[PDB]
Amino acid sequence: LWEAALTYEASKRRCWERVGCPPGHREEPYLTEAGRDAFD
Amino acid sequence: LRRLLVWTYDPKIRLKTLAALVDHCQGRKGGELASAVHAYTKTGDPYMRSLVQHILSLVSH
Amino acid sequence: DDDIAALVVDNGSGMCKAGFAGDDAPRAVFPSIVGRPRKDSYVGDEAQSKRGILTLKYPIEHGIVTNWDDMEKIWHHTFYNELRVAPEEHPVLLTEAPLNPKANREKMTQIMFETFNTPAMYVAIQAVLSLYASGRTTGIVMDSGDGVTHTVPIYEGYALPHAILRLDLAGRDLTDYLMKILTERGYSFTTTAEREIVRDIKEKLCYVALDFEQEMATAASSSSLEKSYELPDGQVITIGNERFRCPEALFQPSFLGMESCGIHETTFNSIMKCDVDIRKDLYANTVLSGGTTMYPGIADRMQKEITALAPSTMKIKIIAPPERKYSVWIGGSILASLSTFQQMWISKQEYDESGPSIVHRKCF
Amino acid sequence: NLNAVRETMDVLLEISRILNTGLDMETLSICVRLCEQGINPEALSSVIKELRKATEALK
Amino acid sequence: AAAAAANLNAVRETMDVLLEISRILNTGLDMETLSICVRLCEQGINPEALSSVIKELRKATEALK
Amino acid sequence: IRRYTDQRSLDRSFGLVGQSFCAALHQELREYYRLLSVLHSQL
Amino acid sequence: KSPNVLLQNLCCRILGRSEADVAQQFQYAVRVIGSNFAPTVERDEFLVAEKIKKELIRQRREADAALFSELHRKLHSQGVLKNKWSILYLLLSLSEDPRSYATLFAQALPRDAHST
Amino acid sequence: LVHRILPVAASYSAVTRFIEEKSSFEYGQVNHALAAAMRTLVKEHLILVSQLEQLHRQGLLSLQKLWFYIQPAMRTMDILASLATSVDKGECLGGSTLSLLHDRSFSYTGDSQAQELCLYLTKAASAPY
Amino acid sequence: SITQLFDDLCEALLPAANRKRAKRSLKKVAYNALFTNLFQLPARNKILMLSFDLRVGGLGPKADRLEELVEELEAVGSVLDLLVQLAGSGPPRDYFLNNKHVGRNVPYSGYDCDDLSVFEMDVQSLISREECLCHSMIQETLQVMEAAPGTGLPTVGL
């Protein structure tokens, strides 16, 4: 169950400032480049 | 343990066997030692029998 | 008690069984004969003994209700002689033969509320109820009693009606065929009372052969089925060969002259029309049932034909009850004890508010 | 076979004792006769525990 | 959360360093077998005892192959 | 009882069925000292 | 999960067979793992690092020992493991050639000087 | 009460001397195995008194409890000491003290305390024979 | 019938000392729980899975006996299938292990001090049990000797 969950792919969007494990958590997206819901 | 007698009961079974094995044998070499270990494995208590059965595996190598 | 006691009235084809739930054996057993002049309000033994100025009439004779006035009469004599209880303090479970129709059910609740005045009620399929007494709620049930016969497949706690196979076989057909063979073999006999006595002899004493071939050869070499019977009146009836042809008619059904399938053919076609994916799950508990256990030797022929029926890749696992003669009564009595069965139990309020037709919807 | 089913009844006792089941000899005989009909045993495991609860409900 | 994914990431990195150590010795075991052998030793188990079954079963998957 | 079950358990002319009767009495008397010990601790 | 079914998963991993096709091997498995559900010795993770070194030099695969010297640091650097002795001792126990004596070389601490 | 507890000590030391004496080479193979099966039962006497001492050190022993503890094991020692005095008195060695054991095993058939004792000693003594 | 054997199950599990109204209610209890599961791997493998936890908790010969009996009962399948479901809710010297004085050519291993110490614990559990009896016999009676009078006897109710 734990090892079954283990086999996944970890995200990119690496950060320079994280030296202790930087996989990725999105350093604040752009306003237009989240469209079709931000638009309305 | 009655002054530790539980642990000191299987002792004085090896030691008492070798009380005679380390007195009878002094300077022996050759087959007179293989005749000096052929009456100390002849015992009814299987402890001394198995201890001298272990010495005789060495000496007959 | 802490809640009002449930009552069960089982209107069977040969006899009527009434009583209170809380017992395994019925409180009263009467015959189902209703005397109508050729007493004038009494249903039971006294009508049967006074049948010389009263003509014959049965409310349930086929195995289901084929006379409604007559059923209301036996229901009224059930309320007064068999019970005389306070009816509004007794919810009643009725039981009829497998698969009650909707209009029959509407007529049933319609008269159950007027002749009896029930506070709440239940109406039930028979073979499922009998299976619930055999200790399972899935399986295939060959219910052949004194009335109608069905091979009912049931899975998911209620019967699968697309493969339910109704088969015309009854105790009516049995007594008529007994008259036919007893007058055909050569004997002076037309009277009704010895017909009942010899029918009891065929029900208890007569042998249901395990196969045709083996018993044919045994009786052909020297008749080993031969047995004498000595009544209090001094009846003398004997030969093994007449006893060998009497229950022979269900091995191959065209032996009598009737057209409907035999036991192996009906149970094979019933288990064939039920789905393959639940077939082996259903076959892990196949049951024997019905009033024909009056002689326990029809079970042997049944389990031999059932092990011949299914392929050898899943073996027989048949439950053979060491009693199934009171099967319908114990079905009712085990069913009504449960607390969850009370949620399918319909009251009088809904029956007044949305018509009688909701007794088909809530109770099914 | 009557020789064999007494010995298998006796060996059947020990594995009911060492598995720490509630059964003694009498209840073992009742349960072996009950499983012989064809009942699923995983269902019987619940009715025995419910009887042993509601027995203690009286006392 | 984030710490509920950081741990599942933090064991994947170690499992792949262990997988590198597993392949440079080039034992015939793979990652799926390794997932059992890691789980067994967290509960505690004798490595001389698991080596006995594995040294039996790898010569038993050739007599029954 | 204490005197009798010791004397007849070294007597052999009292039989070997008598030594078994005495063997039962020995098991019962040991339970009596359980009673005497529970009383003894509370003193 | 639970250990007993986990060993059955191991038996279905190495053998190609399923768990409803073999029962003698699982019986042999409960025979051997049983009463040895913990190390019978004391851990020396330093020595078992040295034994992979002493093994890879013995094969003259001396570059992968210096590679292990950095992988062991990664093992310490992450630190999600509290049993680093068990798996590495096991991996050393299952040793296979990528392609002598240890009776004088030191063995694991046996606890013959302590009442177990 | 000390008088009543004293028989097992006299039924200890007499047993223990016989173990040293009839285990040496000059009394034959069977007497060694007989004494080697009695030394096992000496060991458990030591076993019991050590645990009673551990209870006594924690302020948890009285004479009543101790007497009640020692009553089953006094019977064992009595049977063993009677056998040892019987082996020594007749100057028995070899099969003359398997005849004695054959008789004593049949003698106790209303006990099962002393019968299993002698029967274990017969099974032990017939192994050199 | 099969529903009659369920009455005999109620008869064994409840002895008699009222006692004619409790048995029908227990018969209801026997019927009401059977059909809830019916609305909603081999057999000996689970025996091995339960022998494993025995060996984890020590006690070798018991696991060696449990495996010994199913091996000869396969050399009744539905009744052991009930015992694995009823497990753990019911009621539950030797001189050839650490005594090397008996045998024939006894194994040579030097000495012992590490199982001979768990040969006193084999008696220490008995010594700890037979004192708990006398703790539970002095307690049941000090619950009678000390109370306000007649609150354990119904004689005040007469």
Give the residues across from C230 on adjacent strands.
C236
Of C135, C318, C320, the CB nearest to D39: C135
Distance CA C131, CA C289 (A): 8
In chain C, which ranges are continuous DSSP H helix? 45-49, 68-77, 102-111, 126-133, 171-184, 192-204, 212-221, 240-245, 263-272, 279-283, 298-309, 327-335, 348-353, 358-361
Q: Which contiguous run of DSSP H or E holds residue C125?
A: none
Handedness of CA G96, G101, G106, G112 (dihedral sign): positive
DSSP string, chain I: -HHHHHHHHHHHHS-----SSHHHHHHHHHHHTTSHHHH---SHHHHHHHHHHHHHTS-HHHHHHHHHHHHHH---HHHHHHHTTSTTSS-----SSS--SSSSSPPP----SSSSTTTTHHHHHHHHHTTHHHHHHHHHHHHHHSSSTTSSSGGGG-
Where among C243, C260, C277 does a domain terminate? C260
I99 → closest Cβ in H43, H48, H50: H43
Amino acid symbol at H23: S
| Both tokens assigned to H22 | 């009839």
CB burial readout C93-121, b (16+ within 10 A) else e: bbbbbbbbeeeebebbbeebbebbebbbb
Partners of chain B (3+ Cβ pairs below 8 A):
H, I
Same domain? For C268 and C304 the reply is yes
Determine which helix (DSSP H) or strand (DSSP E) holds C56, and give its type and residue range: none
Closest CA to C322 of C363, C288, C354, C351: C288
d(CA H19, CA H22): 6
Q: Which of C239, C260, C281 is the last residue of a domain?
A: C260
Tokens linked to G15: 């053998």
Domain count, chain C: 3
CA angle centred on B26, ends B24 and B28, rounded to 5°: 100
Partners of A6 on chain E (C-beta within 8 Å) are 8, 11-12, 15, 35
Q: Alpha-carbon distance G92 to E21, whole Å?
A: 10
Closest by Cβ to H64, choosing from F16, F20, F36: F36
Position I25, amino acid: S
Taking the mean position of all CA atoms in its chain, how far away is CA G100? 20
Assess contact for H90 and H82: CB atoms under 8 A: no
Give DSSP secondary structure letters for H90-108: TT--TTHHHHHHHHHHHH-
Least Cα separation, residue A34 to chain E (angstroms): 22
CB I102 within 8 A of CB I95: yes
H contact residues 47-106, partner I, Cβ 8 Å cutoff:
47-48, 50-51, 55
What is the rounded CA–CA span in Å between residue G72 and residue G84? 10
Cα-Cα-Cα-Cα dihedral of H2, H3, H9, H15, to 10°? -160
Query: What backbone torsions phi and psi does residue C90 show, to the nearest 5 degrees?
Result: -150, 100
The answer to whether C143 touches C171, Cβ cutoff 8 Å, is: no
G19-56 exposure pattern, b = at least 16 Cβ within 10 A, e = fewer: beebbebbbbbbbbbbbbbebeeeebeebbbebbbebb
Judge if C87 and C215 occupy the same domain: no
Cβ atoms of residues C31 and C18 within 8 Å = no
B5 CB near a chain H CB, below 8 Å?
yes
Same domain, residue pair C209 and C276? no
Token duo for residue C112: 């159950």
**φ, ψ (nearest 5 deg) of residue G2:** -120, 150
Count the helices and strands in chain A (H runs, E runs).
1, 0
DSSP reduced 3-state for G91: helix
Contacts of C196 (CB under 8 A, 6+ apart): C175
**Rounded CA gap, H82 and A22, in Å?**
85
How far apart (Å, rounded) are the C-alpha atoms in residues H109 and H106? 6
- Tell me the C-alpha to C-alpha distance, in Å, between residue G67 and each of B47, C81, G51, G64: 53, 100, 14, 5
User: What residues of chain E have any CB closer than 8 angstroms to a CB in chain G?
Assistant: 7, 10-11, 13-14, 17-18, 20-22, 24-29, 32-33, 36-58, 60-61, 64-65
- C-beta atoms of B44 and H30 within 8 A: yes
* Whether residue C351 sits in one domain with residue C209: no
Same domain, C195 and C267: no
Beta carbons of G65 and E24 less than 8 angstroms apart? no
Instruction: Please check whether residue A25 touches E, CB under 8 A.
Output: yes
Q: Cα-flanking dihedrals φ and ψ of residue C63, to 5°?
A: 130, -15
Residues forming beta bridges with residue C122, ordered by sequence position:
C93
Q: How far apart are CA C251 and CA B40, in angstroms?
A: 88
Looking at the structure, do residues C251 and C335 belong to the same domain, yes or no?
A: no
Cα dihedral sign, C118-C122-C126-C131? negative
Q: To the nearest 5 percent, what fractions of chain G are helix, strand and coil?
A: 55, 0, 45
Q: Which of I100, I112, I113 sits opposite B47 (nearest CB)?
A: I100
Give the distance from residue C135's alpha carbon to the nearest chain I alpha carbon, in angstroms: 7
Cβ pair I1:C330 closer than 8 A: yes
- How far apart are alpha carbons C288 and C282 in whole angstroms? 14
Determine the residue of chain I that is closest to C323 in CA distance: I1
CB atoms within 10 A of CB F6: 14
What CATH number corresponds to the domain at position C275? 3.30.420.40
Of C260, C282, C308, the position where a domain reaches its end is C260
Q: Does H19 touch chain I if contact means CB atoms closer than 8 Å?
A: no
Chain C segment 303-322 residues within 8 A of D by beta carbon are 317-321
Pairs across F and H, CB distance < 8 A: 30
**Helices E31-42 + G3-14 axis angle, to 10:** 160
Among G5, C281, B34, which Cα is nearest to I48's? G5
Candidate from B10, B11, B53 with C-beta closest to I105 = B53
CB-CB neighbors (< 8 A) of H110 in chain F? 16-17, 19-20, 23
Determination technique used: cryo-EM
* Bridge partners of residue C60, in order along the sequence: C65
Q: Residue I32: list chain C partners with CB under 8 A.
A: 337-339
Indicate the helix (H) or strand (E) that contains H8. Answer: helix H7-21
Same-domain pairing of C321 and C332: no
Residues C26 and C142 in one domain: no
Q: Are residues C253 and C350 in the same domain?
A: no
Same domain, C204 and C230: yes
Q: Which tokens belong to E38?
A: 């890691």
Tokens of I17: 């000392």
Cβ-based burial of F31 (10 A; exposed 0-12, middle 13-18, buried ≥19): exposed
Rounded Cα distance, C126 and B14, in Å:
85
> In a 10 Å sphere around its CB, with 0-12 CB exposed, 13-18 middle and 19+ buried, how is residue I62 labelled?
middle
Quick check: helix, strand or coil at residue D42? helix
Q: Among I111, I118, I124, pick the best mutation site for testing chain B contact (most B Cβ within 10 A).
A: I111
Please, are residues C4 and C31 in contact by the beta-carbon 8 Å criterion? no
In chain I, what residues touch G4 (CB-CB under 8 Å)? 48-50, 52-53
Residue C26's contacts (CB-CB under 8 Å, 6 or more residues apart) are C10, C17, C18, C19, C326, C329
Q: What is the CATH number of the domain that holds C232?
A: 3.90.640.10
Q: How many CA atoms lie within 13 A of I98 on its CB side?
A: 17
Q: Is H20 helix (H, G, I), strand (E, B) or coil?
A: helix
User: Strand pairing partners for G8?
Assistant: none
Query: Exposed, middle or buried by CB within 10 Å (0-12, 13-18, 19+), for C205?
Result: middle
What does H49-97 look like in DSSP terms, one character per residue? Answer: HHHHHHHHHTT---HHHHHHHHHHHHHHHHHHHHHHHHHHHTT--TTHH
Chains F and I touch (3+ CB pairs under 8 A): yes
F33 and H68 Cβ atoms separated by less than 8 Å = yes
Residue C286: phi and psi, rounded to 5, are: -100, 140
Interface probe, candidates I132, I138, I141, I144, chain F, greatest F C-beta count within 10 A: I138
Q: What's the maximum distance between 2 C-alpha atoms anywhere in chain C?
A: 71
Beta partners for E30? none
Cross-sheet strand order for the sheet of C139-144: C165-167, C149-154, C139-144, C286-289, C318-319
Question: How many angstroms from the chain centroid is the CA of residue C181?
Answer: 24
Give chain E positions within 8 Å (CB) of A10.
9, 12
How close does chain E come to A13, measured CA to CA in Å?
Answer: 14
| Nearest C-alpha in H relative to I125 | H51
Q: Which residue of E has its CA nearest to G82?
A: E42
**Rounded to 5 degrees, what are φ and ψ at G107?**
-115, 175
Q: Of the candidates F32, A4, C329, which has an alpha carbon nearest to the alpha carbon of residue G1?
A: A4
Q: Which helix (H) or strand (E) holds C37?
A: strand C36-37
Cβ-based neighbour number of residue D6 at 10 Å: 9
Q: Which of A5, A37, A11 is nearest to A24 (CA)?
A: A11
With CA atoms as reference, the chain E residue closest to G89 would be E47
As a whole number of angstroms, the distance between CA B5 and CA B8 comes to: 5
- Which of C177, C103, C97, C104 is closest to C130 using CA atoms? C97
**I89-98: which pairs have CB atoms within 8 A and are 24 or more residues apart?**
I89/D20, I89/D21, I89/D22, I89/D49, I90/D20, I90/D21, I90/D22, I90/D23, I91/D20, I91/D22, I92/D20, I93/H44, I95/H37, I95/H40
CB B49 within 8 A of CB B43: yes
Query: In sequence order, what are the beta bridge partners of C159?
Result: C154
DSSP letters, C318-332, are EE--S--TTHHHHHH
Q: Is residue G26 within 8 Å of residue G34, measured between CB atoms?
A: no
Residue C21, helix vs strand vs coil:
strand
Residue with the two structure tokens 């049941």: I140
Q: C-alpha C293: how far from its chain's center?
A: 11
Structural domain boundaries, residue C230 = 169-260
- Contacting residues of B for H29, CB less than 8 Å apart: 43-44
Instruction: Note whether C65 and C38 are same-domain residues.
Output: yes
Give the gap in angstroms from C-alpha I101 to the nearest C-alpha of chain G: 22
Angle ∠(C276,C278,C279) on CA atoms, nearest 5 = 60
Which residue numbers of G have CB closer than 8 Å to I's CBs? 3-5, 7-8, 19-20, 23, 26-27, 30, 33-35, 37, 115-116
Please report residues of D whose CB lies closer than 8 A to that of C319. 37-39
Do C208 and C110 lie in one domain? The reply is no
For CA atoms G89, G93, G97, G103, the dihedral sign is positive
Residues 6+ apart with CB under 8 A from C77: C34, C41, C42, C43, C44
Nearest to C74 by CA among C42, C38, C28: C42
